[PDB]
Design a protein around this nucleic acid. Structure first.
Ligand SMILES: [Zn+2]
Ligand SMILES: [Zn+2]
Ligand SMILES: [Zn+2]
Ligand SMILES: [Zn+2]
Ligand SMILES: [Zn+2]
Length: 143
DNA sequence: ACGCAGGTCCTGGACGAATT
DNA sequence: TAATTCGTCCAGGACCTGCG
């Protein structure tokens, strides 16, 4: 089971050169599954079929409680926790709990105090990019 | 006023599982 | 078994919203 072919990008081992070339597509994108609409590339054909719904607006995962539909089954699973009051994600620092995992991750950054987004007009610094974008509307409306 | 931050759901890379 | 395809988790983000 010796493997002598290595990828110079991630270091993974392969027994045949043909296996290394097939893997190397993950770094170059060459010959990866390509969407016929936008020509962006994905790691396998299943991820491509998933992305295909972004062009059709199909939402095949419907909540049986409220009737709303979602593009991904994981999104429906996260949404169902709202109905059930299930908040398994908690900030270890202050104890605030969330049903949404990204809401928890986003909140925990506030304990660091980092504000890496600075308004190019007035210099006001924000912890989040979406709040900086909304702040810049104030300058556009001022003009 | 508007800065703050939580609510919500879309997007796709990661990676083991299932299928071919 | 190896290659391919699938299911799923997860990270990141956009848009929305009311509070102080
Ligand atoms: Zn590699
Ligand atoms: Zn596309
Ligand atoms: Zn619902
Ligand atoms: Zn906290
Ligand atoms: Zn500004």
């Amino acid at each position: 089971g010796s493997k002598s072919f290595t990828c110079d990008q991630c270091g993974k081992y392969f027994s045949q050169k043909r296996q290394l070339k097939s893997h190397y597509r993950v770094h170059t994108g060459h010959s990866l599954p390509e969407c016929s609409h936008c020509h962006r590339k994905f790691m396998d054909v299943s991820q491509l079929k998933k992305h295909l719904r972004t062009h059709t607006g199909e939402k095949p995962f419907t909540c049986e409680i409220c009737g709303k539909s979602f593009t991904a089954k994981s999104s429906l699973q996260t949404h169902i926790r709202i109905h059930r009051g299930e908040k398994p994600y908690s900030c270890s620092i202050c104890g605030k709990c969330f049903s949404d995992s990204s809401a928890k991750r986003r909140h925990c950054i506030l304990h660091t105090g980092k504000k890496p987004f600075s308004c190019p007009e007035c210099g006001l610094q924000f912890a989040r990019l979406d709040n900086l974008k909304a702040h810049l509307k104030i300058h556009s409306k001022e003009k």
